Design a protein around this ligand. Structure first.
Ligand SMILES: CCN(CC)S(=O)(=O)c1ccc2c(c1)/C(=C1/Nc3ccccc3/C1=N\O)C(=O)N2
Length: 348
């Protein structure tokens, strides 16, 4: 039975390369970036995922740079990295070895969707709350993810622990230094990007989070456009034509549209949708980027009260994961929020 030994650098520790041995290799994902494998660490039998990407020798890998910095319970941890050869000989591949997690928010929601059901709202709150924590943490470093969607939210369904993954589009955003407008997956892409903004902020991640939340409530994407222009048309059918001031706030440059009225929020969603879910969604899916809640404010929204109840359990009987162990860094955008975020029973 085949074992592979490589010399790998620890993700967060000091740059002393070390021998790492793994076995039980299988393909579990792929994309334009390259390929993702599952493997088992001989060391501790622990399962990991190995993401293998092509390395341009002109420039450093920004994915690697960003992932080395990250240490959070709701973010897939970079354990090691190493270099190898691969398919296109005389080329160098970067291998990222990450926490392995067996499900995605997308897969779980599709199980329900295929059965013509929607996910119980307790799971919607657990997932969305963990998404907003991981966004609060990355945004506190100025890092924007730029590809928030259900497929990038890994899940352990026994524990309900969620971890953000795929930092392939992520970037440190610097005020006055321009960024590409054509990013994010289309269904989740903020309107200021559709309008060609290059000066956008971390708030585009919040718009994407709002789209994930509405998909969970609806059982299908809320804005399924076939192109960028048709993406705006989908957005408009629900939100109405953006006003002049809204366009200005989105892109101080970028027309006359068919004047179309906002669809009432309550009838976008199924009859019995909790009002608090709808009110949250409306404060995420705003045209004016500055009007959207921050990640930390989203966590403190009433929609998530049930998670702060001392007697709350997962449906399967087990205790909820870590939800209240906020750090100084996490709270930094708005320290007084801690009084809400950390309930009395979680301080002790
Ligand atoms: C989805 C995000 N990626 C692109 C495939 S990724 O950055 O390469 C990436 C990175 C670390 C990762 C993963 C994916 C990952 C994944 N576990 C899974 C289990 C079932 C189906 C898909 C995945 C999956 N991925 O589809 C995992 O356990 N650690």
């Amino acid at each position: 039975s085949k074992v592979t030994t490589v010399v790998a650098t620890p993700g967060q520790g000091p740059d002393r390369p070390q021998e790492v041995s793994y076995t039980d290799t299988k393909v579990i994902g792929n994309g334009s970036f390259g390929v993702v494998y599952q493997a088992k660490l001989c060391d501790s039998g622990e399962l990991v995922a190995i993401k293998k990407v092509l390395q341009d020798k002109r420039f450093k890998n920004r994915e690697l740079q960003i992932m080395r910095k990250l240490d959070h319970c709701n973010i897939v941890r970079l354990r090691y990295f190493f270099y190898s050869s691969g398919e296109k000989k005389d080329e160098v591949y970067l291998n990222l070895v990450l926490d392995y997690v067996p499900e995605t928010v997308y897969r779980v929601a599709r199980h329900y969707s295929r059965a013509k059901q929607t996910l119980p709202v307790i799971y919607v709150k657990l997932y969305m709350y963990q998404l907003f924590r991981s966004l609060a943490y990355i945004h506190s470093f100025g890092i924007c993810h730029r590809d928030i969607k259900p497929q990038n939210l890994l899940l352990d369904p026994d524990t309900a622990v969620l971890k953000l993954c795929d930092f392939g589009s992520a970037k440190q955003l610097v005020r006055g230094e321009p960024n590409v407008s054509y990013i994010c997956s289309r269904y989740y892409r903020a309107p200021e990007l559709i309008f060609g903004a290059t000066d956008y902020t971390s708030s585009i991640d919040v718009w994407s989070a709002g789209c994930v939340l509405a998909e969970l409530l609806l059982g299908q994407p809320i804005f399924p456009g076939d192109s960028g222009v048709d993406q705006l048309v989908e957005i408009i059918k629900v939100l109405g034509t953006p006003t002049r001031e809204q366009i200005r706030e989105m892109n101080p440059n970028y027309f006359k549209f068919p004047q179309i009225k906002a669809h009432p929020w309550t009838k976008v969603f199924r009859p019995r949708t909790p009002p608090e879910a709808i009110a949250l969604c409306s404060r995420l899916l705003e045209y004016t980027p500055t009007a959207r809640l921050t990640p930390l404010e989203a966590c403190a929204h009433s929609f998530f009260d049930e998670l702060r109840d001392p007697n709350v359990k997962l449906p399967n009987g087990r205790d909820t994961p870590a939800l209240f162990n906020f750090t100084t860094q996490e709270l930094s955008s708005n320290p007084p929020l801690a009084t809400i975020l950390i309930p009395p029973h979680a301080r002790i």
